[PDB]
Structures are given as structure tokens and as C-alpha cells.
Design a protein around this ligand. Structure first.
Ligand code: SAH
Ligand code: 7JX
Ligand code: MG
Ligand code: NA
Length: 213
């Protein structure tokens, strides 16, 4: 039995089926009262909400699903017809995420892709008929942010206006990623400060808006 299963079980026992809000609230309650887990969380969730509302992406890509907290957070604000693709390398996490989406009633707006981002990204065009992305949420292994971003660039999946939203750019930290996007005229960056309450340390998100090549 694992932490992630315990989270899922707490939700099935306490949340209301078909109700994404109550699912979020239960995950936050559990991970705040019983055992911490690396969900983006409610504070950073507020920033993610504002971003989705401002840009109204029709096609979103998430890197790193874990227990589905962030997938549920975003999918619940998507407009009719909009969709979320989420890539998860670990099949145990994809399973928990799938069940979390099922319980929330969001399964028709979200598609889980099983694999490593770098394996799946070059397949997006021809296998999943993607033209370009409207938004990408990066929240997988920190060493992957930069190479995957350059890979997204090279496969031609970004367009002028595409919103990159990167979590944990301070802790554990993604210095090479930040240096690249902040350094580059191809991206316009904003930093959103946020505090990780359990670890009592300042973190943040970076919003990088692509300008084209
Ligand atoms: N290269 C990669 N491709 C796909 N998934 C990856 C990956 N590297 C790490 N992961 C997955 O990314 C997750 C990071 S935690 C993701 C948290 C989630 N976004 C939330 O806030 O709810 C883990 O489940 C891990 O298995
Ligand atoms: O939000 C987070 C906090 C900490 Br600490 C570690 C994380 C690791 C991953 Cl892979 C994704 N998110 C994380
Ligand atoms: Mg994170
Ligand atoms: Na910049």
C-alpha cells in the first residue's frame, strides 16, 4: 500500500462523485493534515486557475500527472470542446490519475498518455493529430524542463502565444530552464512567487509566453 493509493482512497471515501471541487478539497485536506505529497496544491492552484481563465486554451499539455490533482485543477476550467493531454511515465501514477479523473467526472476532457514525455512529444502530431499547443504545464523531473521545451520547439508544437507554465522553478529548482527562457527573445516571462507551507520555503512558478522562433 502506498501514499498515492492512500490519497486516492481518502478521496473516494470523502469527496462527492462528479464534483471536481470536492475532489481538490479532499486531496488538499489529506495532504495537509495526514501526509504531504508533491501536488501543486491550492495556493499554486489559484495561480494556475487565473492563467487558464486568462488564456482559455483549447489544447493543454501537462508533463507529469502523478495523482491527477493538477489534471483535475485545469480540466475543470476548460471550455466546452477544449482538451487536456497529460503525460505520465509511471503506470501506477497513470492509474491513480485515471481513477481521480473518473471520480471527478472529467474523464472525457482528459487523455492520459503512458510514457516518458520525450518519447511521446514527437508522436503528438501524427499519432494524436495535434497541430500546435495552446498551453503546457511543466511539473515533471526538474532536469527535463529544458530539453523537453527545446524538443517541443523543434517538433513545431509551439505557436506565438503558447503559454508555458513551469512549477518548481525555485525548489527543487530549474536554473538552466529559467536562464534559457528569461535569456531568450523567444519567450516573455513572468515570475509568480509562492510559499511551500510544509517545507517552509519560498518557491515559484514561471509563466513563459512563446513569441515564435
Ligand atoms: N519524463 C517524464 N515523462 C512523463 N512523466 C514524468 C516524467 N518525469 C517524471 N514524471 C512523472 O511526473 C510526476 C511529477 S509530480 C507531478 C504533480 C502533478 N502535476 C500535480 O500537481 O498534481 C510523477 O508522477 C512522475 O512519475
Ligand atoms: O511541487 C513539487 C515540490 C517538490 Br519539494 C518536488 C516536486 C517534484 C516533482 Cl517531480 C514535481 N513537483 C514537486
Ligand atoms: Mg510541483
Ligand atoms: Na525572456
Amino acid at each position: 500500500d502506498t501514499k498515492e493509493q492512500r490519497i486516492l482512497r481518502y478521496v473516494q471515501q470523502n469527496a462527492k462523485p462528479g464534483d471536481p471541487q470536492s475532489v481538490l478539497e479532499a486531496i488538499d485536506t489529506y495532504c495537509t493534515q495526514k501526509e504531504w505529497a508533491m501536488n501543486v496544491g491550492d495556493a499554486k492552484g489559484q495561480i494556475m486557475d487565473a492563467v487558464i481563465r486568462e488564456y482559455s486554451p483549447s489544447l493543454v499539455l501537462e508533463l507529469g500527472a502523478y495523482c491527477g490533482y493538477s489534471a483535475v485543477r485545469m480540466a475543470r476550467l476548460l471550455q466546452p470542446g477544449a482538451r487536456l493531454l497529460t503525460m505520465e511515465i509511471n503506470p501506477d501514477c497513470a492509474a491513480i490519475t485515471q481513477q481521480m479523473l473518473n471520480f471527478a467526472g472529467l474523464q472525457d476532457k482528459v487523455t492520459i498518455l503512458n510514457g516518458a514525455s520525450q518519447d511521446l512529444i514527437p508522436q503528438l502530431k501524427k499519432k494524436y493529430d495535434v497541430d500546435t499547443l495552446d498551453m503546457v504545464f511543466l511539473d515533471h523531473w526538474k532536469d527535463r524542463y529544458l530539453p523537453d521545451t527545446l524538443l517541443l520547439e523543434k517538433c513545431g508544437l509551439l505557436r506565438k502565444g503558447t503559454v508555458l507554465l513551469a512549477d518548481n522553478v525555485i525548489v527543487p529548482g530549474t536554473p538552466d530552464f529559467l536562464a534559457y527562457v528569461r535569456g531568450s527573445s523567444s519567450f516573455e516571462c513572468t515570475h509568480y512567487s509562492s510559499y511551500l507551507e510544509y517545507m517552509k520555503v519560498v518557491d515559484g512558478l514561471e509563466k513563459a509566453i512563446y513569441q515564435g522562433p
